[PDB]
Design a protein around this ligand. Structure first.
Ligand SMILES: *SCCNC(=O)CCNC(=O)[C@H](O)C(C)(C)COP(=O)(O)OP(=O)(O)OC[C@H]1O[C@@H](n2cnc3c(N)ncnc32)[C@H](O)[C@@H]1OP(=O)(O)O
Length: 159
């Protein structure tokens, strides 16, 4: 894979809004979004966030990430992290998380990255574990059916 990145652009949003492939994946990234996900909902999320970035390979937008929180000198919290359904398992998220860690260091002088992941998202938990994030706490949340779920809060020092 020859991946590159750049800031997200308007023309990328139609593609990116298609990355959650079912209500579970939608929930994992946008727990208050309504199915189907739409560009208006994605734009609304981006508006609240910083550092929206896309990963590109062979002319295709395959990954998207941003920051949910950013505290200069202190930490950033990874927000959205989504990969095109046809390109999973190929290292796109590993790549883009690395990019976002560099951006955290460079633009915010962060010394820590925080992530949180819903309990049902095994791929997400394993991703972050593989990248050296450690679990710190677990919080109760609710899904769109009002069922109780566990949000696993993790972090990693940035060097
Ligand atoms: S916004 C909340 C998080 N995002 C989502 O839940 C959105 C839906 N999921 C996805 O977009 C992708 O499945 C994510 C979770 C973003 C993973 O993206 P990639 O497929 O690009 O992951 P990489 O190929 O970079 O893999 C890095 C490590 O991640 C773990 N992992 C990925 N996929 C799986 C599955 N299917 N099952 C178990 N573990 C998975 C692995 O630890 C992987 O490391 P390896 O070295 O490949 O083992």
């Amino acid at each position: 894979m020859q991946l590159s990145h750049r800031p997200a652009e308007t023309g990328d949003l139609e593609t990116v809004a298609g990355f959650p492939q079912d209500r579970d994946e939608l929930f994992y990234c946008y727990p208050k979004a309504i199915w189907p996900f739409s560009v208006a909902q994605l734009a609304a999320a981006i508006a609240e966030r910083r550092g929206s970035t896309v990963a590109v390979h062979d002319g295709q937008v395959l990954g998207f990430a941003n920051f949910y929180q950013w505290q200069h000198g202190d930490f950033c919290a990874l927000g959205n992290m989504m990969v095109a359904p046809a390109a999973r398992g190929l290292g796109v998220a590993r790549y883009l998380i690395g990019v976002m860690e560099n951006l955290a260091r460079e633009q915010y002088k962060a010394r820590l990255m925080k992530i949180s992941c819903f309990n049902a998202n095994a791929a997400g938990l394993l991703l972050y574990t593989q990248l050296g994030y450690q679990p710190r706490a677990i919080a109760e949340r609710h899904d769109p059916d009002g069922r109780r779920v566990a949000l696993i809060q993790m972090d990693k020092p940035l060097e």
